[PDB]
C-alpha cells in the first residue's frame, strides 16, 4: 500500500524489463538501423531527454507520461506475441512484466490519453525484407522505451521516497 514498497517494486520491474528487451533485440540481430530512425510510436510524446529536463518536470506530469508510455506498449507487445507464434520466450515474459509494472504504476498515481501503435500490418508483411525492418524497429524501440522508463522510475524514487540522496 505504501508509496515505498511500490517504487521499490517498480524499479525492480523496470530494470528487469529493460534487460530482457536488450538481450532479445541483441539476439534478434543474427543495415537495418537505417530504417529504425524515427520509427517509434512513442516519438510523438513530450518526454524529457536530459537530467536537466527530468528535474524541471514535476511528479504529476512525469508519472502520467510513464503510464502512457506503458499503456502504449501492451498493444504492440501483445501482437508481437500473437504474431510471433528464446525470441518467442522473452516476449511472453515482457508482456507479463509490463502488465505488472503498469499495475504498480496505477497504484502509485492514486496516492499521489496515450499514443496508438499501428505497425501491425507491417509485421505481417509479404516481403521478408520489410518484415525484418518492422521487427527490428519494434525491438529497437522497446529496448529504447524500457531503458527510458527504468531510468525515469529510478529517478522519481530518489526524488520522492529519498528526497534526492
Amino acid at each position: 500500500v505504501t508509496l515505498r514498497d511500490l517504487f521499490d517494486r517498480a524499479v525492480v520491474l523496470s530494470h528487469y524489463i529493460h534487460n530482457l528487451s536488450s538481450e532479445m533485440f541483441s539476439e534478434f540481430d543474427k543495415g537495418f538501423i537505417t530504417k529504425a530512425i524515427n520509427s517509434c510510436h512513442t516519438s510523438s510524446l513530450a518526454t524529457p531527454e536530459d537530467k536537466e529536463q527530468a528535474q524541471q518536470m514535476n511528479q504529476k506530469d512525469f508519472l502520467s507520461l510513464i503510464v502512457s508510455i506503458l499503456r502504449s506498449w501492451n498493444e504492440p507487445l501483445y501482437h508481437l506475441v500473437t504474431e510471433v507464434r528464446a525470441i518467442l520466450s522473452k516476449a511472453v515474459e515482457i508482456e507479463e512484466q509490463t502488465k505488472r509494472l503498469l499495475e504498480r504504476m496505477e497504484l502509485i498515481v492514486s496516492q499521489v490519453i496515450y499514443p496508438v501503435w499501428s505497425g501491425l500490418p507491417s509485421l505481417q508483411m509479404a516481403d521478408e525484407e520489410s518484415r525484418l525492418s518492422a521487427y527490428y524497429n519494434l525491438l529497437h524501440c522497446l529496448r529504447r522505451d524500457s531503458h527510458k522508463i527504468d531510468n525515469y522510475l529510478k529517478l522519481l524514487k530518489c526524488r520522492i521516497i529519498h528526497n534526492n540522496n
Partner: protein, 195 residues
C-alpha cells in the same frame, strides 16, 4: 596525396550527460591538413558540426551537456581534407544510451579492522543522488604471487568487508552503470594483515 578514409572508432559517455567520440586518420593516404565532424539527430533535418574539438584532445569530438540527449540516435560523419582532396568516414549511428562507461572509482582506502574494511567514492561528476545514474561496484584482490584474483560483487555500496593469513594484499575496485560498461580497474591499494 589525398587522405585517407577515416574511421570513428569509439564513442563513450562517462555519465549520460556528455559524451565524446574519436577517429583515426585513414587507411593510407596523404597527411590530412584538416578534420571535420558533422552529424544529425533523429527527429531533425538540420545538420550540425562538432561543438568542440579541443577538450577531448587529438582527433576527437566532445559533446557537452548542451548537445547531449539520451534516447535519440546521432548520425555522424568525419570529413578528412587536403589541398589535394578529401574523404568521408562511413556514417556512424550512435545512441548515448548504449555507450555508457564511467571513470574508475576514487579514493580506494583499506583498513584492517574480525575483518578488513574497503571504502571508495564514485567517480566525480556522476549524478547519483538524484536517481539519474545508478552505479554498481566490484572489488578484486590478490596475494602477491597468486595465479588468479578474487572478485566480490558489492552492488550499490560504497563499502564492503572480507574474512581471509598474515599477508600482503593488492586491492582494486571498478564500477559499471546499471546498464553499460565496466570502468577500468582503479589503481591498486596495498594492505598488510598482521597476526
Amino acid at each position: 596525396l589525398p587522405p585517407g578514409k577515416p574511421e570513428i572508432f569509439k564513442c563513450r559517455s562517462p555519465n549520460k550527460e556528455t559524451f565524446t567520440c574519436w577517429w583515426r586518420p585513414g587507411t593510407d593516404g596523404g597527411l590530412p591538413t584538416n578534420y571535420s565532424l558533422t552529424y544529425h539527430r533523429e527527429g531533425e533535418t538540420l545538420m550540425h558540426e562538432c561543438p568542440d574539438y579541443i577538450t577531448g584532445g587529438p582527433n576527437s569530438c566532445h559533446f557537452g551537456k548542451q548537445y547531449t540527449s539520451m534516447w535519440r540516435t546521432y548520425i555522424m560523419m568525419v570529413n578528412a581534407t587536403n589541398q589535394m582532396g578529401s574523404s568521408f568516414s562511413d556514417e556512424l549511428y550512435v545512441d548515448v544510451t548504449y555507450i555508457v562507461q564511467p571513470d574508475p572509482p576514487l579514493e580506494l582506502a583499506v583498513e584492517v579492522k574480525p575483518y578488513l574494511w574497503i571504502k571508495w567514492s564514485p567517480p566525480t561528476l556522476i549524478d547519483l543522488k538524484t536517481g539519474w545514474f545508478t552505479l554498481l561496484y566490484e572489488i578484486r584482490l590478490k596475494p602477491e604471487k597468486a595465479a588468479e584474483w578474487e572478485i566480490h560483487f558489492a552492488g550499490q555500496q560504497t563499502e564492503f568487508k572480507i574474512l581471509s593469513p598474515g599477508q600482503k594484499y593488492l586491492v582494486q575496485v571498478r564500477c559499471k552503470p546499471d546498464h553499460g560498461y565496466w570502468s577500468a580497474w582503479s589503481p591498486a591499494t596495498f594492505i598488510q594483515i598482521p597476526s
